[PDB]
């Protein structure tokens, strides 16, 4: 779920 | 009340373009050291990253560091927490008097949104109780610096954008590599605590309204600190911290914090259409310091 | 995940900060902008009083250069000549600003977004984004000594458009400036007189962009099920404090990416016009006309204009 | 009512 920019 | 940022000039001159292979994000250039998110060396985006493996198979000649298109020379790379510290030959002659600070929930700071090592936007933001912030970032934003400028001119570096959680919330790390709220710089399913209303800010906001002739919302009711604190439990609000700070503005209103505490309860219910300084709901976006500074220049 | 977040920002203030100077005449102190060998600032700096009707003609003729004091970060520049143009002064100095950015001068029109560098005593203290409203005012944040604060836009090629010098706060709280040619926006007077502005209209183009941003960020509760055509909406806008919608195809990019037509966002504006009731939209508690289509597309997809 | 900043 988390997205690293 | 206007949400504004402190001038970004001194910080702009520290922002650099950091490229590894073809991966490009932002770095901060202080002295002879460039700090950037470590995931710049990550081979993939949709998969759990083996940073140890990524780092031992890391090669320096694949780095490209630039300031306004001028290339610096990479000399050394060290990994510390969730960031890399890239040693460069040239020293940043525009290194401002600075320190490194780790923010606490409730602290306001400024985000310099950067892409490709060039700043594209600047805005004020608050660190929430769940250690996230609500900014606006897309592809290539990581490494964007967060900062505060003290009165003596000292720049506090305190945020490097890294991740957006599934909830939409944004998270960064400090310059020591510590990711705020102990989130991982991994694409894993990570859920944060529910956000709480910064009640200190709401109180400050309501004092601002009083100072602008907005008084309609003033409740005739009184509520003590403890009574409000467990009203706060059931409505997504923080504890009130903690009465003695508002003694100065209590006078110009004739309103006690307790009278500023009971109205929040009544207004939480709803405004009935009416507004407060343009807002149709309670606002915790402004600190007391921001209010006083915008009101009186302090 | 499932959004990017909509945040109000100003463009970086760096290149403009290096142009801000402290301009003092007698005991009056405000801000000036230093480009080339010329400092532009509000002309009321030479007014013996600012709290009374000013005879500017007399003010300029009794002006003496040795009462001027121009400094940048405490370093004093040498005043060589002063000339009056509209509501501003152009102060010629010996030293030329070596940090003069590639610049032009633009006059804003209602609906244009720009950036304010709020300055005091020649030092920038805050930066924020604003819209020039339909009544030629802005909703900024200023206190005593703010005058001369520059408004600007930065083009893609890096050219700075200088377009605002803060001058006035009306009795309503609304703020007014001039362009760098001296023209006071909306033809207001640079006098402490009673001046009234036109009632403000909601920038309908901006609200549409805002609602698209809301959809692209997962906010959908407000979406109306009915459609309203452009002419049908413009007839409603004239009668409820909204501007006309220009022109249902600039939104083709976001209409495509959301699957919601502009007409469906127009009927929603009508319904949401009342108020949000209890609910929220991206943190805003009423309809928001603060974001242009360009601002939205920029924050969503990273492209310009 | 207006004031010069």
Author numbering:
A (entry chain E), D (entry chain D): 1 to 5
B (entry chain A): 3 to 300
C (entry chain B): -2 to 302
Task: List sentences from the manuscript.
Here, we report the crystal structure of HCoV-NL63 Mpro in complex with a synthetic peptidomimetic inhibitor, N3. The two molecules form a typical homodimer, which has been observed in the crystal structures of other CoV Mpros485253. Domain I (residues 8–100) and domain II (residues 101–183) together form a chymotrypsin-like fold, and the substrate-binding site is located in a cleft formed between domain I and domain II. The catalytic dyad composed of Cys144 and His41 lies in the center of substrate-binding site. The carbonyl oxygen of ester on N3 is very close to the backbone NH of Gly142 and the backbone of NH of Cys144, which mimics the tetrahedral oxyanion intermediate state formed during serine protease cleavage and provides additional support to anchor the Michael acceptor. In our enzyme-inhibitor complex structure, the lactam ring of N3 molecule serves as a structural analog to glutamine or histidine at P1 position, and protrudes into the S1 pocket by forming a 2.5 Å hydrogen bond between the lactam oxygen and the imidazole ring NH of His163, which is similar to those in the complex structures of SARS-CoV Mpro and HCoV-HKU1 Mpro with inhibitor N34953. As observed in the HCoV-NL63 structure with N3, the aliphatic isobutyl side chain of P2 protrudes into the deep S2 pocket via interactions with the alkyl portion of the side chains of Asp187, Pro189, and is well accommodated onto the Van der Waals surface of the pocket. Further, the NH and carbonyl oxygen of P3 backbone form two hydrogen bonds with the backbone carbonyl oxygen and NH of Glu166 respectively, which help anchor the N3 inhibitor to the HCoV-NL63 Mpro at P3 location. The crystal structure of HCoV-NL63 Mpro shows that the size of its S1 pocket is comparable to that of HCoV-HKU1, but smaller than those of HCoV-229E and SARS-CoV.
These two polypeptides are cotranslationally cleaved into mature nonstructural proteins (Nsps) through two proteases encoded in the 5′ region of ORF1: papain-like protease (PLP) and 3C-like protease (3CL or Nsp5). 3CL protease is more commonly known as Mpro because of its dominant role in the posttranslational processing of the replicase polyprotein. The Mpros from different human and animal CoVs are known to share significant homology in both primary amino acid sequence and 3D architecture, providing a strong structural basis for designing wide-spectrum anti-CoV inhibitors4849.
